[PDB]
């Protein structure tokens, strides 16, 4: 599968001025566009070489749309302050994410459109793209408004049509990277804890996409105890890193194996000290 996602954050500035607005666009785990209200250009900007192919009409259109998005979020911050009976003195945050997935068959798989206020679920379009999950009575008010205005129907037209057409266009134009998997480069390190104990760390580096599974086995059976698994992290060059560790009795390192599953690996890998 593949995905296109846009992420929007607006943060009110009660001391002075309008909200800080940041928009970012992703295809899978690759950022391809940005807008920041604090930046100089006041344009949607490219963040991958393959989107720089797009002509002036594209960049003018996305700038117009992203600025309209910015203003909607400013208004939202005002509206929500009213719904929740909050003062003008405090800073608050709205977040919105939307986008689409195509499945293994390259056809529409799923669409998303969801919203949070101060980091809590507000309203989300359900998977059927015809109904809403409103978290509380403020979001219920939004739900009533959006149902009367046929918002779901408008979003569904985008998510099932235009959204997937954009995604497919981008996937072709950026295929050299977007449709290339980078298999994890793996190795093991050994860290003596005492005369009796040692930590084995299994490394996965320079992989894309970010999805990966690292598991330990002892004598060919899974082990969670005395293990540690770090959160997957960006290398900074568009690839990702992860490690898993297990503490073992010194001299028994041979018993343990690290197993790595990734889209770029035809069959999963096994490492052993």
């Amino acid at each position: 599968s593949h995905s296109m996602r846009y992420f929007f954050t607006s943060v009110s500035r009660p001391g002075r001025g309008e909200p800080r607005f940041i928009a970012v666009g992703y295809v899978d785990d690759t950022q391809f566009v940005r807008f920041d209200s604090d930046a100089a250009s006041q344009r949607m900007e490219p963040r991958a070489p393959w989107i720089e192919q797009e002509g002036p009409e594209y960049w003018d259109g996305e700038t117009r749309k992203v600025k309209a998005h910015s203003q909607t979020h400013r208004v939202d911050l005002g509206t929500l302050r009213g719904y929740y009976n909050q003062s003008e003195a405090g800073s608050h945050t709205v977040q919105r994410m939307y986008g689409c997935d195509v499945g293994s068959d390259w056809r529409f798989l799923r669409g998303y459109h969801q919203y949070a206020y101060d980091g809590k679920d507000y309203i989300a379009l359900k998977e059927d793209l015809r109904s809403w999950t409103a978290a509380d009575m403020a979001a219920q008010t939004t739900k009533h408004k959006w149902e009367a205005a046929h918002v779901a129907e408008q979003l569904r037209a985008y998510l099932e049509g235009t959204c997937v057409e954009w995604l497919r266009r981008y996937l072709e134009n950026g295929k050299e990277t977007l449709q290339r998997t980078d298999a994890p480069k793996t190795h093991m390190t050994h860290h003596a804890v005492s005369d009796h104990e040692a930590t084995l760390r299994c490394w996965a580096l320079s992989f894309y996409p970010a999805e990966i599974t690292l598991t330990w086995q002892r004598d060919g059976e899974d082990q969670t105890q005395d293990t540690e698994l770090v959160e997957t992290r960006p290398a900074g060059d568009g690839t990702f890193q992860k490690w898993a560790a297990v503490v073992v009795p010194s001299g028994q390192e041979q018993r343990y194996t690290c197993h790595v599953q990734h889209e770029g690996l035809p069959k999963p890998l096994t490492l052993r000290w």
């Binding site: 749309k65 309209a68 939202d76 509206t79 309203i123 939004t142 408008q154 979003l155 985008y158 235009t162």
Partner: peptide, 9 residues
């Protein structure tokens, strides 16, 4: 490409 019209809460 972005949504042409974003709904306000």
């Amino acid at each position: 490409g972005l949504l042409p019209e974003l709904p306000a809460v």
